[PDB]
PDB file of all heavy atoms in Angstrom:
ATOM      1  N   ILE A  67       4.881   3.141 -13.468  1.00 12.63           N
ATOM      2  CA  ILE A  67       3.493   2.901 -13.255  1.00 12.63           C
ATOM      3  C   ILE A  67       2.645   4.188 -13.568  1.00 12.63           C
ATOM      4  O   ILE A  67       3.311   5.316 -13.524  1.00 12.63           O
ATOM      5  CB  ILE A  67       3.102   2.474 -11.856  1.00 12.63           C
ATOM      6  CG1 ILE A  67       3.633   3.525 -10.852  1.00 12.63           C
ATOM      7  CG2 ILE A  67       3.720   1.112 -11.570  1.00 12.63           C
ATOM      8  CD1 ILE A  67       3.108   3.212  -9.344  1.00 12.63           C
ATOM      9  N   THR A  68       1.443   4.108 -13.946  1.00 11.65           N
ATOM     10  CA  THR A  68       0.583   5.236 -14.226  1.00 11.65           C
ATOM     11  C   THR A  68      -0.412   5.325 -13.061  1.00 11.65           C
ATOM     12  O   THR A  68      -0.942   4.340 -12.688  1.00 11.65           O
ATOM     13  CB  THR A  68      -0.180   5.013 -15.550  1.00 11.65           C
ATOM     14  OG1 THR A  68       0.767   5.090 -16.598  1.00 11.65           O
ATOM     15  CG2 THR A  68      -1.150   6.236 -15.776  1.00 11.65           C
ATOM     16  N   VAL A  69      -0.669   6.580 -12.641  1.00 10.24           N
ATOM     17  CA  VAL A  69      -1.731   6.861 -11.658  1.00 10.24           C
ATOM     18  C   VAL A  69      -2.725   7.794 -12.414  1.00 10.24           C
ATOM     19  O   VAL A  69      -2.604   8.975 -12.356  1.00 10.24           O
ATOM     20  CB  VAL A  69      -1.212   7.539 -10.318  1.00 10.24           C
ATOM     21  CG1 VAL A  69      -2.345   7.808  -9.408  1.00 10.24           C
ATOM     22  CG2 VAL A  69      -0.136   6.666  -9.741  1.00 10.24           C
ATOM     23  N   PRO A  70      -3.695   7.192 -13.065  1.00  8.37           N
ATOM     24  CA  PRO A  70      -4.623   7.990 -13.986  1.00  8.37           C
ATOM     25  C   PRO A  70      -5.603   8.717 -13.128  1.00  8.37           C
ATOM     26  O   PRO A  70      -5.861   8.370 -11.928  1.00  8.37           O
ATOM     27  CB  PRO A  70      -5.377   6.862 -14.746  1.00  8.37           C
ATOM     28  CG  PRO A  70      -4.607   5.587 -14.461  1.00  8.37           C
ATOM     29  CD  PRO A  70      -3.938   5.756 -13.102  1.00  8.37           C
ATOM     30  N   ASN A  71      -6.189   9.818 -13.685  1.00  7.05           N
ATOM     31  CA  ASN A  71      -7.313  10.520 -13.001  1.00  7.05           C
ATOM     32  C   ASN A  71      -6.999  10.860 -11.543  1.00  7.05           C
ATOM     33  O   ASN A  71      -7.737  10.549 -10.670  1.00  7.05           O
ATOM     34  CB  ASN A  71      -8.516   9.721 -13.099  1.00  7.05           C
ATOM     35  CG  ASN A  71      -8.747   9.308 -14.613  1.00  7.05           C
ATOM     36  OD1 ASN A  71      -9.431   8.280 -14.818  1.00  7.05           O
ATOM     37  ND2 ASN A  71      -8.399  10.103 -15.494  1.00  7.05           N
ATOM     38  N   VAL A  72      -5.875  11.515 -11.400  1.00  4.52           N
ATOM     39  CA  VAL A  72      -5.295  11.915 -10.046  1.00  4.52           C
ATOM     40  C   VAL A  72      -6.271  12.651  -9.192  1.00  4.52           C
ATOM     41  O   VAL A  72      -6.839  13.688  -9.609  1.00  4.52           O
ATOM     42  CB  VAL A  72      -3.999  12.733 -10.177  1.00  4.52           C
ATOM     43  CG1 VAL A  72      -3.661  13.359  -8.827  1.00  4.52           C
ATOM     44  CG2 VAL A  72      -2.858  11.806 -10.528  1.00  4.52           C
ATOM     45  N   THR A  73      -6.434  12.233  -7.879  1.00  4.42           N
ATOM     46  CA  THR A  73      -7.280  12.946  -6.916  1.00  4.42           C
ATOM     47  C   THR A  73      -6.314  13.558  -5.924  1.00  4.42           C
ATOM     48  O   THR A  73      -5.144  13.356  -5.889  1.00  4.42           O
ATOM     49  CB  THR A  73      -8.218  11.988  -6.143  1.00  4.42           C
ATOM     50  OG1 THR A  73      -7.397  11.190  -5.352  1.00  4.42           O
ATOM     51  CG2 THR A  73      -8.994  11.096  -7.080  1.00  4.42           C
ATOM     52  N   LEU A  74      -6.904  14.518  -5.185  1.00  4.56           N
ATOM     53  CA  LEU A  74      -6.116  15.204  -4.117  1.00  4.56           C
ATOM     54  C   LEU A  74      -5.486  14.180  -3.138  1.00  4.56           C
ATOM     55  O   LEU A  74      -4.444  14.447  -2.558  1.00  4.56           O
ATOM     56  CB  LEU A  74      -6.950  16.252  -3.450  1.00  4.56           C
ATOM     57  CG  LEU A  74      -7.469  17.537  -4.133  1.00  4.56           C
ATOM     58  CD1 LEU A  74      -6.335  18.148  -5.049  1.00  4.56           C
ATOM     59  CD2 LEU A  74      -8.667  17.296  -4.834  1.00  4.56           C
ATOM     60  N   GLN A  75      -6.291  13.051  -2.919  1.00  6.63           N
ATOM     61  CA  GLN A  75      -5.762  12.105  -1.947  1.00  6.63           C
ATOM     62  C   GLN A  75      -4.692  11.180  -2.428  1.00  6.63           C
ATOM     63  O   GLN A  75      -4.199  10.278  -1.739  1.00  6.63           O
ATOM     64  CB  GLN A  75      -6.924  11.267  -1.426  1.00  6.63           C
ATOM     65  CG  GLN A  75      -8.199  11.344  -2.223  1.00  6.63           C
ATOM     66  CD  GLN A  75      -8.893  12.769  -2.119  1.00  6.63           C
ATOM     67  OE1 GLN A  75      -9.484  13.222  -3.068  1.00  6.63           O
ATOM     68  NE2 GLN A  75      -8.816  13.283  -0.886  1.00  6.63           N
ATOM     69  N   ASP A  76      -4.285  11.358  -3.766  1.00  6.57           N
ATOM     70  CA  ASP A  76      -3.116  10.501  -4.274  1.00  6.57           C
ATOM     71  C   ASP A  76      -1.823  11.268  -3.991  1.00  6.57           C
ATOM     72  O   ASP A  76      -0.762  10.747  -4.284  1.00  6.57           O
ATOM     73  CB  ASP A  76      -3.281  10.441  -5.839  1.00  6.57           C
ATOM     74  CG  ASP A  76      -4.363   9.556  -6.303  1.00  6.57           C
ATOM     75  OD1 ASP A  76      -4.575   8.434  -5.629  1.00  6.57           O
ATOM     76  OD2 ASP A  76      -5.084   9.831  -7.303  1.00  6.57           O
ATOM     77  N   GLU A  77      -1.876  12.324  -3.255  1.00  9.70           N
ATOM     78  CA  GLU A  77      -0.693  13.017  -2.737  1.00  9.70           C
ATOM     79  C   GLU A  77       0.022  12.177  -1.759  1.00  9.70           C
ATOM     80  O   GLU A  77      -0.509  11.228  -1.190  1.00  9.70           O
ATOM     81  CB  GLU A  77      -1.010  14.390  -2.106  1.00  9.70           C
ATOM     82  CG  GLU A  77      -1.846  14.108  -0.817  1.00  9.70           C
ATOM     83  CD  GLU A  77      -2.193  15.415  -0.060  1.00  9.70           C
ATOM     84  OE1 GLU A  77      -1.658  16.539  -0.502  1.00  9.70           O
ATOM     85  OE2 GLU A  77      -3.003  15.381   0.955  1.00  9.70           O
ATOM     86  N   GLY A  78       1.323  12.417  -1.590  1.00 11.67           N
ATOM     87  CA  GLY A  78       2.125  11.808  -0.560  1.00 11.67           C
ATOM     88  C   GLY A  78       3.456  11.188  -1.005  1.00 11.67           C
ATOM     89  O   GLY A  78       3.785  11.417  -2.187  1.00 11.67           O
ATOM     90  N   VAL A  79       4.205  10.500  -0.160  1.00 11.35           N
ATOM     91  CA  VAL A  79       5.479  10.016  -0.562  1.00 11.35           C
ATOM     92  C   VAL A  79       5.317   8.549  -0.978  1.00 11.35           C
ATOM     93  O   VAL A  79       5.044   7.666  -0.240  1.00 11.35           O
ATOM     94  CB  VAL A  79       6.503  10.064   0.630  1.00 11.35           C
ATOM     95  CG1 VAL A  79       7.822   9.456   0.235  1.00 11.35           C
ATOM     96  CG2 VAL A  79       6.686  11.596   0.941  1.00 11.35           C
ATOM     97  N   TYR A  80       5.641   8.306  -2.331  1.00 15.60           N
ATOM     98  CA  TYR A  80       5.627   7.018  -2.862  1.00 15.60           C
ATOM     99  C   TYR A  80       6.994   6.476  -2.794  1.00 15.60           C
ATOM    100  O   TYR A  80       7.991   7.313  -2.845  1.00 15.60           O
ATOM    101  CB  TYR A  80       5.229   7.038  -4.278  1.00 15.60           C
ATOM    102  CG  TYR A  80       3.742   7.399  -4.579  1.00 15.60           C
ATOM    103  CD1 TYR A  80       3.300   8.650  -4.322  1.00 15.60           C
ATOM    104  CD2 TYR A  80       2.839   6.418  -4.929  1.00 15.60           C
ATOM    105  CE1 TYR A  80       1.889   8.996  -4.604  1.00 15.60           C
ATOM    106  CE2 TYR A  80       1.535   6.652  -5.153  1.00 15.60           C
ATOM    107  CZ  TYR A  80       1.057   7.941  -4.926  1.00 15.60           C
ATOM    108  OH  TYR A  80      -0.264   8.257  -5.140  1.00 15.60           O
ATOM    109  N   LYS A  81       7.244   5.171  -2.695  1.00 16.85           N
ATOM    110  CA  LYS A  81       8.639   4.702  -2.595  1.00 16.85           C
ATOM    111  C   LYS A  81       8.915   3.612  -3.646  1.00 16.85           C
ATOM    112  O   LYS A  81       8.064   2.759  -3.898  1.00 16.85           O
ATOM    113  CB  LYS A  81       8.915   3.989  -1.179  1.00 16.85           C
ATOM    114  CG  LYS A  81       8.815   5.132  -0.075  1.00 16.85           C
ATOM    115  CD  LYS A  81       9.119   4.446   1.269  1.00 16.85           C
ATOM    116  CE  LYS A  81       9.052   5.443   2.339  1.00 16.85           C
ATOM    117  NZ  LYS A  81       9.573   4.895   3.681  1.00 16.85           N
ATOM    118  N   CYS A  82      10.083   3.621  -4.243  1.00 17.46           N
ATOM    119  CA  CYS A  82      10.468   2.547  -5.132  1.00 17.46           C
ATOM    120  C   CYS A  82      11.678   1.895  -4.462  1.00 17.46           C
ATOM    121  O   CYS A  82      12.624   2.443  -4.112  1.00 17.46           O
ATOM    122  CB  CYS A  82      10.913   3.139  -6.471  1.00 17.46           C
ATOM    123  SG  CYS A  82      11.734   1.800  -7.512  1.00 17.46           S
ATOM    124  N   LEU A  83      11.536   0.505  -4.263  1.00 19.98           N
ATOM    125  CA  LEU A  83      12.555  -0.258  -3.678  1.00 19.98           C
ATOM    126  C   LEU A  83      13.196  -1.194  -4.766  1.00 19.98           C
ATOM    127  O   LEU A  83      12.491  -1.715  -5.590  1.00 19.98           O
ATOM    128  CB  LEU A  83      12.004  -1.136  -2.569  1.00 19.98           C
ATOM    129  CG  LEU A  83      11.816  -0.573  -1.159  1.00 19.98           C
ATOM    130  CD1 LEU A  83      10.792   0.545  -1.244  1.00 19.98           C
ATOM    131  CD2 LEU A  83      11.318  -1.618  -0.164  1.00 19.98           C
ATOM    132  N   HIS A  84      14.546  -1.246  -4.697  1.00 20.69           N
ATOM    133  CA  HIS A  84      15.257  -2.107  -5.621  1.00 20.69           C
ATOM    134  C   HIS A  84      16.072  -3.178  -4.677  1.00 20.69           C
ATOM    135  O   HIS A  84      16.896  -2.830  -3.896  1.00 20.69           O
ATOM    136  CB  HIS A  84      16.241  -1.262  -6.432  1.00 20.69           C
ATOM    137  CG  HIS A  84      17.076  -2.011  -7.438  1.00 20.69           C
ATOM    138  ND1 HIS A  84      18.287  -1.623  -7.779  1.00 20.69           N
ATOM    139  CD2 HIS A  84      16.768  -3.090  -8.168  1.00 20.69           C
ATOM    140  CE1 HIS A  84      18.790  -2.382  -8.724  1.00 20.69           C
ATOM    141  NE2 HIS A  84      17.777  -3.309  -8.955  1.00 20.69           N
ATOM    142  N   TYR A  85      15.670  -4.416  -4.861  1.00 22.35           N
ATOM    143  CA  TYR A  85      16.268  -5.573  -4.192  1.00 22.35           C
ATOM    144  C   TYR A  85      17.392  -6.179  -4.932  1.00 22.35           C
ATOM    145  O   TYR A  85      17.137  -6.900  -5.882  1.00 22.35           O
ATOM    146  CB  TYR A  85      15.104  -6.562  -3.880  1.00 22.35           C
ATOM    147  CG  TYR A  85      13.975  -6.098  -3.046  1.00 22.35           C
ATOM    148  CD1 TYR A  85      12.993  -5.353  -3.635  1.00 22.35           C
ATOM    149  CD2 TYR A  85      13.813  -6.556  -1.748  1.00 22.35           C
ATOM    150  CE1 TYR A  85      11.887  -4.923  -2.847  1.00 22.35           C
ATOM    151  CE2 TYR A  85      12.782  -6.081  -0.961  1.00 22.35           C
ATOM    152  CZ  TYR A  85      11.783  -5.310  -1.547  1.00 22.35           C
ATOM    153  OH  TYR A  85      10.730  -4.910  -0.687  1.00 22.35           O
ATOM    154  N   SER A  86      18.633  -5.957  -4.488  1.00 21.87           N
ATOM    155  CA  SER A  86      19.773  -6.677  -5.073  1.00 21.87           C
ATOM    156  C   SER A  86      20.577  -7.155  -3.847  1.00 21.87           C
ATOM    157  O   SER A  86      19.897  -7.699  -2.946  1.00 21.87           O
ATOM    158  CB  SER A  86      20.650  -5.783  -5.947  1.00 21.87           C
ATOM    159  OG  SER A  86      21.185  -4.617  -5.301  1.00 21.87           O
ATOM    160  N   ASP A  87      21.907  -7.096  -3.768  1.00 19.76           N
ATOM    161  CA  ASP A  87      22.623  -7.519  -2.701  1.00 19.76           C
ATOM    162  C   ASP A  87      22.164  -6.812  -1.451  1.00 19.76           C
ATOM    163  O   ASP A  87      22.204  -7.353  -0.295  1.00 19.76           O
ATOM    164  CB  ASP A  87      24.112  -7.365  -2.899  1.00 19.76           C
ATOM    165  CG  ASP A  87      24.705  -8.436  -3.769  1.00 19.76           C
ATOM    166  OD1 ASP A  87      23.970  -9.349  -4.186  1.00 19.76           O
ATOM    167  OD2 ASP A  87      25.861  -8.359  -4.153  1.00 19.76           O
ATOM    168  N   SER A  88      21.680  -5.534  -1.604  1.00 19.64           N
ATOM    169  CA  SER A  88      21.071  -4.792  -0.582  1.00 19.64           C
ATOM    170  C   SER A  88      19.770  -4.063  -1.147  1.00 19.64           C
ATOM    171  O   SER A  88      19.585  -4.152  -2.274  1.00 19.64           O
ATOM    172  CB  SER A  88      21.991  -3.770  -0.021  1.00 19.64           C
ATOM    173  OG  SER A  88      22.538  -2.926  -1.048  1.00 19.64           O
ATOM    174  N   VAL A  89      18.973  -3.454  -0.247  1.00 19.86           N
ATOM    175  CA  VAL A  89      17.810  -2.812  -0.741  1.00 19.86           C
ATOM    176  C   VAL A  89      18.035  -1.328  -0.737  1.00 19.86           C
ATOM    177  O   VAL A  89      18.437  -0.658   0.249  1.00 19.86           O
ATOM    178  CB  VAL A  89      16.653  -3.101   0.187  1.00 19.86           C
ATOM    179  CG1 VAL A  89      15.335  -2.423  -0.300  1.00 19.86           C
ATOM    180  CG2 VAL A  89      16.425  -4.642   0.343  1.00 19.86           C
ATOM    181  N   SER A  90      17.851  -0.700  -1.931  1.00 19.81           N
ATOM    182  CA  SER A  90      17.906   0.748  -2.043  1.00 19.81           C
ATOM    183  C   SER A  90      16.505   1.271  -2.205  1.00 19.81           C
ATOM    184  O   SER A  90      15.649   0.641  -2.856  1.00 19.81           O
ATOM    185  CB  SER A  90      18.750   1.204  -3.208  1.00 19.81           C
ATOM    186  OG  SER A  90      18.164   0.802  -4.463  1.00 19.81           O
ATOM    187  N   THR A  91      16.308   2.459  -1.677  1.00 20.82           N
ATOM    188  CA  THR A  91      14.975   3.064  -1.673  1.00 20.82           C
ATOM    189  C   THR A  91      15.030   4.499  -2.236  1.00 20.82           C
ATOM    190  O   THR A  91      15.813   5.296  -1.799  1.00 20.82           O
ATOM    191  CB  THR A  91      14.348   3.145  -0.268  1.00 20.82           C
ATOM    192  OG1 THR A  91      14.262   1.831   0.291  1.00 20.82           O
ATOM    193  CG2 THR A  91      12.986   3.810  -0.269  1.00 20.82           C
ATOM    194  N   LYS A  92      14.157   4.767  -3.223  1.00 19.76           N
ATOM    195  CA  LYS A  92      14.040   6.094  -3.763  1.00 19.76           C
ATOM    196  C   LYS A  92      12.641   6.646  -3.296  1.00 19.76           C
ATOM    197  O   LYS A  92      11.669   5.933  -3.366  1.00 19.76           O
ATOM    198  CB  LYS A  92      13.966   6.156  -5.333  1.00 19.76           C
ATOM    199  CG  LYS A  92      15.263   5.655  -5.908  1.00 19.76           C
ATOM    200  CD  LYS A  92      15.070   5.413  -7.420  1.00 19.76           C
ATOM    201  CE  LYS A  92      16.375   4.986  -8.076  1.00 19.76           C
ATOM    202  NZ  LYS A  92      17.289   6.194  -8.405  1.00 19.76           N
ATOM    203  N   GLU A  93      12.600   7.876  -2.813  1.00 20.05           N
ATOM    204  CA  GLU A  93      11.378   8.436  -2.271  1.00 20.05           C
ATOM    205  C   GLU A  93      10.876   9.550  -3.164  1.00 20.05           C
ATOM    206  O   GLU A  93      11.691  10.442  -3.530  1.00 20.05           O
ATOM    207  CB  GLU A  93      11.524   8.934  -0.839  1.00 20.05           C
ATOM    208  CG  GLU A  93      11.846   7.894   0.145  1.00 20.05           C
ATOM    209  CD  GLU A  93      12.046   8.408   1.590  1.00 20.05           C
ATOM    210  OE1 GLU A  93      11.749   9.566   1.754  1.00 20.05           O
ATOM    211  OE2 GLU A  93      12.308   7.649   2.464  1.00 20.05           O
ATOM    212  N   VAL A  94       9.659   9.537  -3.667  1.00 21.55           N
ATOM    213  CA  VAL A  94       9.072  10.524  -4.521  1.00 21.55           C
ATOM    214  C   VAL A  94       7.888  11.174  -3.931  1.00 21.55           C
ATOM    215  O   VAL A  94       6.892  10.569  -3.666  1.00 21.55           O
ATOM    216  CB  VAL A  94       8.660   9.930  -5.913  1.00 21.55           C
ATOM    217  CG1 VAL A  94       8.123  10.925  -6.771  1.00 21.55           C
ATOM    218  CG2 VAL A  94       9.911   9.181  -6.538  1.00 21.55           C
ATOM    219  N   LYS A  95       8.170  12.477  -3.600  1.00 22.19           N
ATOM    220  CA  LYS A  95       7.064  13.186  -2.999  1.00 22.19           C
ATOM    221  C   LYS A  95       6.108  13.788  -4.031  1.00 22.19           C
ATOM    222  O   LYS A  95       6.504  14.405  -4.965  1.00 22.19           O
ATOM    223  CB  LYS A  95       7.650  14.366  -2.127  1.00 22.19           C
ATOM    224  CG  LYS A  95       6.637  15.273  -1.508  1.00 22.19           C
ATOM    225  CD  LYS A  95       7.292  16.481  -0.965  1.00 22.19           C
ATOM    226  CE  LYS A  95       6.330  17.530  -0.365  1.00 22.19           C
ATOM    227  NZ  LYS A  95       7.130  18.691   0.158  1.00 22.19           N
ATOM    228  N   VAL A  96       4.860  13.383  -4.000  1.00 21.41           N
ATOM    229  CA  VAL A  96       3.779  13.836  -4.982  1.00 21.41           C
ATOM    230  C   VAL A  96       2.968  14.837  -4.425  1.00 21.41           C
ATOM    231  O   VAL A  96       2.368  14.681  -3.306  1.00 21.41           O
ATOM    232  CB  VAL A  96       2.955  12.593  -5.470  1.00 21.41           C
ATOM    233  CG1 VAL A  96       1.825  13.121  -6.373  1.00 21.41           C
ATOM    234  CG2 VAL A  96       3.768  11.679  -6.214  1.00 21.41           C
ATOM    235  N   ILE A  97       2.879  16.082  -5.112  1.00 17.98           N
ATOM    236  CA  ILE A  97       2.032  17.122  -4.704  1.00 17.98           C
ATOM    237  C   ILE A  97       0.877  17.283  -5.736  1.00 17.98           C
ATOM    238  O   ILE A  97       1.202  17.314  -6.919  1.00 17.98           O
ATOM    239  CB  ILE A  97       2.798  18.473  -4.783  1.00 17.98           C
ATOM    240  CG1 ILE A  97       4.067  18.417  -3.846  1.00 17.98           C
ATOM    241  CG2 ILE A  97       1.941  19.692  -4.442  1.00 17.98           C
ATOM    242  CD1 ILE A  97       4.997  19.553  -3.851  1.00 17.98           C
ATOM    243  N   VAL A  98      -0.312  17.347  -5.296  1.00 15.37           N
ATOM    244  CA  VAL A  98      -1.480  17.434  -6.186  1.00 15.37           C
ATOM    245  C   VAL A  98      -2.038  18.823  -6.073  1.00 15.37           C
ATOM    246  O   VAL A  98      -2.405  19.206  -4.988  1.00 15.37           O
ATOM    247  CB  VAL A  98      -2.507  16.286  -5.930  1.00 15.37           C
ATOM    248  CG1 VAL A  98      -3.629  16.447  -7.015  1.00 15.37           C
ATOM    249  CG2 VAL A  98      -1.875  14.939  -5.885  1.00 15.37           C
ATOM    250  N   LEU A  99      -2.117  19.481  -7.241  1.00 11.63           N
ATOM    251  CA  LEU A  99      -2.717  20.808  -7.309  1.00 11.63           C
ATOM    252  C   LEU A  99      -4.191  20.766  -7.503  1.00 11.63           C
ATOM    253  O   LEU A  99      -4.631  20.105  -8.405  1.00 11.63           O
ATOM    254  CB  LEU A  99      -1.996  21.705  -8.342  1.00 11.63           C
ATOM    255  CG  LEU A  99      -0.536  21.857  -8.183  1.00 11.63           C
ATOM    256  CD1 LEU A  99       0.075  22.730  -9.383  1.00 11.63           C
ATOM    257  CD2 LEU A  99      -0.149  22.504  -6.910  1.00 11.63           C
TER     258      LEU A  99
END
């Protein structure tokens, strides 16, 4: 996904979940300068 025209408030931990036999989660910490 694209997050265009990033603002300071777009910072934080985004999560991607993958649903198969179990649910796996990847956490992506976004820092906005």
Side-chain angles (χ1 to χ4, degrees):
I67 62 172
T68 294
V69 183
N71 306 149
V72 162
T73 70
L74 292 320
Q75 15 290 144
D76 289 320
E77 68 180 350
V79 177
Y80 291 74
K81 295 181 182 192
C82 171
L83 279 60
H84 185 210
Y85 298 77
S86 59
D87 285 353
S88 57
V89 181
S90 69
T91 299
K92 298 170 176 280
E93 295 180 5
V94 178
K95 181 189 173 179
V96 173
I97 300 170
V98 184
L99 301 179

